[PDB]
Amino acid sequence: TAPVALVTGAAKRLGSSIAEALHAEGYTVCLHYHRSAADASTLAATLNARRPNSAITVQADLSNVATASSVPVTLFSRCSALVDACYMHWGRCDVLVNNASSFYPTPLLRKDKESLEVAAADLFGSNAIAPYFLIKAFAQRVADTRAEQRGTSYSIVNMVDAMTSQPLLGYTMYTMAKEALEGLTRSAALELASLQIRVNGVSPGLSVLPDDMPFSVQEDYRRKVPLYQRNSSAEEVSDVVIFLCSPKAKYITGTCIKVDGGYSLTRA
Amino acid sequence: SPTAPVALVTGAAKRLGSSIAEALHAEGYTVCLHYHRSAADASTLAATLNARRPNSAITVQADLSNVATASSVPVTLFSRCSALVDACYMHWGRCDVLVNNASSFYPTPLLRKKESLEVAAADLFGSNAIAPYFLIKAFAQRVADTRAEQRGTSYSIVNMVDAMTSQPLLGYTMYTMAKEALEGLTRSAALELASLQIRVNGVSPGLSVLPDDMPFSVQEDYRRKVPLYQRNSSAEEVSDVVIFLCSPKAKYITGTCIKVDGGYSLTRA
Amino acid sequence: TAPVALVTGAAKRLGSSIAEALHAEGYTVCLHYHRSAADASTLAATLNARRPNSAITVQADLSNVATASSVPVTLFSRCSALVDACYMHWGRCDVLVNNASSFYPTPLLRDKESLEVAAADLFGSNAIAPYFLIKAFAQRVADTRAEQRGTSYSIVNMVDAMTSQPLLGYTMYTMAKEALEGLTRSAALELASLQIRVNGVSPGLSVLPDDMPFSVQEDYRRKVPLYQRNSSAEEVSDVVIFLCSPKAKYITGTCIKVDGGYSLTRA
Amino acid sequence: PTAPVALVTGAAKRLGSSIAEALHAEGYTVCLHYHRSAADASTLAATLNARRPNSAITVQADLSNVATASSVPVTLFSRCSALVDACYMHWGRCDVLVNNASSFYPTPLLRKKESLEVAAADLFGSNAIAPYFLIKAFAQRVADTRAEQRGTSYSIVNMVDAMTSQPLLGYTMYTMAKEALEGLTRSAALELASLQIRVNGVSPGLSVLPDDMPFSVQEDYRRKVPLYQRNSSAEEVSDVVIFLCSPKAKYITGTCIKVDGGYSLTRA
Ligand SMILES: NC(=O)C1=CN([C@@H]2O[C@H](COP(=O)(O)OP(=O)(O)OC[C@H]3O[C@@H](n4cnc5c(N)ncnc54)[C@H](OP(=O)(O)O)[C@@H]3O)[C@@H](O)[C@H]2O)C=CC1
Ligand SMILES: NC(=O)C1=CN([C@@H]2O[C@H](COP(=O)(O)OP(=O)(O)OC[C@H]3O[C@@H](n4cnc5c(N)ncnc54)[C@H](OP(=O)(O)O)[C@@H]3O)[C@@H](O)[C@H]2O)C=CC1
Ligand SMILES: NC(=O)C1=CN([C@@H]2O[C@H](COP(=O)(O)OP(=O)(O)OC[C@H]3O[C@@H](n4cnc5c(N)ncnc54)[C@H](OP(=O)(O)O)[C@@H]3O)[C@@H](O)[C@H]2O)C=CC1
Ligand SMILES: NC(=O)C1=CN([C@@H]2O[C@H](COP(=O)(O)OP(=O)(O)OC[C@H]3O[C@@H](n4cnc5c(N)ncnc54)[C@H](OP(=O)(O)O)[C@@H]3O)[C@@H](O)[C@H]2O)C=CC1
Ligand SMILES: CN(Cc1cnc2nc(N)nc(N)c2n1)c1ccc(C(=O)N[C@@H](CCC(=O)O)C(=O)O)cc1
């Protein structure tokens, strides 16, 4: 049976890329998404096209809140349902890629109590709390699975950020969530090491800029990166993921790989 | 109208919080001792302190876990945290130093042997990270909401973190995650509040006053692991770094974490 | 024409594993060595047996000391000469892997001759040599007319994942690796213009010495969080092939650990 | 009983001079080392001696990794031992060591020999190799001192650089030497904790800028520092040294304190 892989935020951009790659490597993918249901399916189509039954599409709000079912469903629940939506269909889940991520200002000063305490649940859920549970569910299912019938390449990859050291002004929560994630990587790696589950992170610097920001803006940004003076492509990033998941890196765990074109070496 | 500096120390009830608060009080600060369940010890401290200097200490109970408390609508962590910064302004009309000391410290295995989780997820992250976030925020605004002329001259925020978070203690994943989120907060906060001359740093203890209940045999096991003096640090040693960062001897220091581990994080397995 | 890779200390153990791996990817390899002449040749033999003129050898003490000849040859000279050997023979040098490394105690607390020499040896092979080498290497890429340059210049520095937790008694060694780490980031930033990536691979525990009592060996391997065993040479070399592969072309000035989680442990 | 001795290298001017003074005013008897500023060394020695008789001396040595003329040429190590010897041979004690002396100039990889070989020795020598030796000489004396005749506060302090994670373009040799000095700090701290010798580093960001640097150059550097938009004074740096040597930091070892004003928190 082919290896299965869950990729949160597989709808568009990077997550979309990481999924294909894993698919191309011969992985049945569980394409996760939040708002974009179009792309999440447009993709699954193409994927199943290329190879019959090789891509499903689970949907879930990964923010740290509760959605209506009688009792509301916590974030833990929703998460434990994804990992669960795999063993249910393909009977296995070998690779998890916490990609899903909210990213926007959370200033400390100014120029709405709730906008914040909802962003907190947002930024902190997608980037850190959700990954914790996901990693936990994934780790249990393997634990439960009998020794004799376990996969041989369980790999977990959290998508962090290579610039958190030099915090992006005004993005406090995001930054905390991210560094909270790195800790998750390290901690997960050490503990889950026994079940032979690897946990590593990929720290992109300036990858595919937001489909939103203008051109003059993207220019100003990509021109700050030392290598090539351009942001990375979805590929230059996903390769690091497929590499981390391939056997060519089976002795690697609890580590983060920067893919920033030397961006983190620059100073103001 | 000179008036004495105010310091808000969360978890100032006992152990390190108490040491830090007493240390600050001793330097001349008036202190708002926050606590959660140690109502009696916090009162004892305050008592001791107000006997030395009248009206130089007050207490404030408040659960820093990221949940809501009963009041019309229940009260959110955000709100409760604003109440704290406000206590100082309401009582002394100022707040110059904040020390995020309050921290829940317990295991949260990824494997088996529910609700226990969701509470620990709100308790560990709220106390060690989210609460510190709202506090630094509220503390920062008041500074801004204050006239350039009536502004203190030594605003200092100190986040109590962990020096061993790089070598994750087995089983404490959320705590570890939270401590490092707190590190991000330290760096991020420092960068963003520089403009208001509010310094933000962290004190990273290795092994200080060991947990209250852990037995002798278990403790002395931990002491032989510290390269320097083969012991854990006293409270006075940890709190001494805290007074340093709040003194004008450190005014140009911000966004940094000072280790007080005795070399412990240099050791390998 | 086929890519060239210069691997210092490629005589045995890991360098031998890295050299052989690059060779497999199609790289033509220059196997430098210091004392291990026998092993280096045996390897060049095997490699040139799988493909004619796919490997050559070069001997050089990378210790920061002056050598024989007329006038003494500085470490710089030997270094630059090492790079020129690749250009003289295959007319191109694309990958440089600083692997050569002296590794032994230099206790702070106790003659002095021993010290002056450990300093030159330990800092020579781990930092000074790598510097000069990178420098000679970059010079060549620069002196090449834009049109003729290679499309994949990659430099990889072999460092250590346990430098943050100093191995008691190896100060000079630890100091040198830290300098090697600095070299990686500094060179990386300064060579980005020339499209020359500079990265590091930091193993934790791999192919233990050789003169390590099986008791002592099994000691260390039960300390490793993943598989409770040290790594293989191949597990460290896969990282090098990856860093030089085009699938890492946007990576530079970074270090990738291959410790199996060993650096995540405390005492 | 006696006054603590503090050996400060390159203590003739700037930061060094500020440290020797700060240490002196705390009660320490200081040994002012210099390379070329023999004049400044003297003005300072006179001043420190005027406030207190025989409370400071000067010692000249080239901390660069090159031999000098006396029978045989003197190695860097010899000179380093002579620096510590000087302290014991005058006060019978050496309690504090501040590795402040440091060469700092470009060593560009690309063209634009003997010019490098001398630079390599000077840079690495002063910034890393000498410090290793001075620490060694300093440590052996304590070791060859009976447990009871030992002081109650051995404190070594190395002046490092908070901006090495973001290498100053063109200064590779310098940057490596500092990283080396950083390793020295961690390693020496671990191996000297048994002798109760604390070893820490002070990481300045922008302090007394190198002179002959046009006002406009200095001003455009300061405007980059998040806090106060100015470089620090020498006092703001020495204040951190005096703290590390105080019993207020008696449990602190193997760490580096930044005094950069957040400048290392920024990004390009
Ligand atoms: N792109 C870059 O330049 C960089 C990216 N990174 C990291 O890479 C990872 C992916 O980045 P990038 O590809 O730009 O991200 P995308 O911007 O392409 O967004 C990924 C998405 O995951 C989903 N998501 C967002 N919030 C939530 C939530 N609360 N619950 C559930 N799902 C949510 C969304 O799905 P949607 O389809 O459903 O609505 C969102 O579009 C992140 O962890 C990011 O921080 C780091 C540095 C740089
Ligand atoms: N001492 C040590 O060995 C080490 C300490 N540290 C860090 O130092 C700081 C203090 O450590 P230490 O002195 O041991 O801590 P203590 O064990 O002092 O506990 C601090 C306390 O703050 C309060 N608190 C905990 N959870 C909550 C919550 N959810 N809401 C409100 N208040 C809460 C509690 O109050 P309570 O009395 O009022 O009810 C608790 O006693 C922490 O940040 C800790 O993580 C790091 C490494 C080691
Ligand atoms: N082994 C491990 O588990 C670990 C390895 N590393 C790093 O990986 C790399 C390879 O380590 P490992 O495989 O054990 O190394 P070995 O390769 O043990 O030795 C490499 C060699 O390079 C050469 N060399 C040593 N000193 C000098 C010198 N002064 N001048 C010139 N050449 C010299 C020698 O050549 P010789 O044969 O020709 O004469 C020596 O055999 C190193 O950089 C090491 O620091 C890091 C952590 C762990
Ligand atoms: N100034 C700043 O803003 C920053 C400083 N730092 C660190 O602070 C420390 C002091 O910096 P700064 O105050 O600018 O230094 P100074 O520029 O004041 O120079 C210190 C000196 O020590 C001596 N010295 C230098 N090279 C050698 C050598 N090869 N042999 C013997 N003596 C030598 C010289 O003595 P001389 O009088 O005798 O001839 C030299 O003037 C350094 O370690 C530096 O790396 C880090 C970041 C920023
Ligand atoms: C790559 N970089 C793009 C980018 C695109 N999507 C992402 N998505 C996630 N989840 N995480 C990221 N780190 C991320 N990064 C950036 C960097 C800064 C700003 C930015 O600052 N934007 C503000 C303006 C700046 C401000 O708040 O001061 C805006 O909303 O227009 C935008 C994109």
Ligand SMILES: CN(Cc1cnc2nc(N)nc(N)c2n1)c1ccc(C(=O)N[C@@H](CCC(=O)O)C(=O)O)cc1
């Ligand atoms: C200093 N060190 C003590 C200590 C005391 N109070 C604190 N309080 C806070 N908020 N944060 C800390 N880091 C902290 N640390 C430690 C380290 C590990 C264990 C520990 O592992 N305890 C488990 C046993 C181990 C396990 O879960 O495997 C138990 O509950 O008995 C306890 C105290």
Ligand SMILES: CN(Cc1cnc2nc(N)nc(N)c2n1)c1ccc(C(=O)N[C@@H](CCC(=O)O)C(=O)O)cc1
């Ligand atoms: C993987 N590890 C092996 C090892 C093998 N070759 C290497 N070669 C190089 N160039 N670099 C390395 N880091 C390296 N590491 C180790 C670690 C510690 C000791 C060790 O401490 N050996 C002393 C004993 C310990 C002591 O000095 O206290 C001895 O010479 O027997 C040996 C091998």
Ligand SMILES: CN(Cc1cnc2nc(N)nc(N)c2n1)c1ccc(C(=O)N[C@@H](CCC(=O)O)C(=O)O)cc1
């Ligand atoms: C604080 N900062 C000053 C400064 C002054 N003295 C020092 N002295 C020592 N020993 N160490 C330092 N880090 C140091 N730093 C700086 C930073 C960069 C340049 C600089 O780049 N100078 C070149 C110009 C730039 C280049 O080579 O591209 C020159 O010589 O004019 C100078 C001073």
